[PDB]
């Protein structure tokens, strides 16, 4: 049986891009997000915009 | 999946070309242009011409 596909949640490398809205975590945390439906999601891609 | 090809809007060097009509922005701003259709376009090249 395939017991489960578990991601490796270690810290990835922090490539310093000079973009202002490219904040990123290097610890346990997670970005909270919603979408237009109001469902709550969670991510670590910190590439941001308006 | 390719979410998007993001432009990086860090300004380059303001290389002093000795010409006169070559005004260039080094901040958030963007030049406004039109063509013969009257369609609006926006740019950052400063090389200008009568």
């Amino acid at each position: 049986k395939v017991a489960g596909i578990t991601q490796d949640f270690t810290d990835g490398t922090t490539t310093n891009t000079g973009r202002g809205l490219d904040v990123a975590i290097s610890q346990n945390g997670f970005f909270r997000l919603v979408d237009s439906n109001g469902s709550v999601f969670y991510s670590r891609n910190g590439q941001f915009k308006l | 999946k390719v979410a998007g090809i993001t432009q990086d809007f860090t300004d380059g060097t303001t290389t002093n070309t000795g010409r006169g009509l070559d005004v260039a922005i080094s901040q958030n701003g963007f030049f406004r242009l039109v063509d013969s259709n009257g369609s609006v376009f926006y740019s950052r090249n400063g090389q200008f011409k009568l």
Binding site: - | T10, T13, S26
Partner: protein, 51 residues
């Protein structure tokens, strides 16, 4: 990478030509001396992109 210096090269070339323009205009009457005044660029990067 190039940016940093090629503006440094252009700044130092204008500095040398201002000094040569001072030395060439030594003892011409009513001349006023010249000194180039420079400035450094920065951007949204914290690194400095030249002169």
């Amino acid at each position: 990478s190039f940016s940093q210096a090629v503006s440094g090269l252009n700044a130092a070339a204008t500095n040398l030509d201002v000094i040569g323009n001072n030395i060439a205009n030594s003892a011409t009457y009513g001349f006023k001396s010249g000194t180039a005044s420079f400035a450094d660029m920065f951007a949204g990067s914290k690194v400095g992109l030249g002169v």
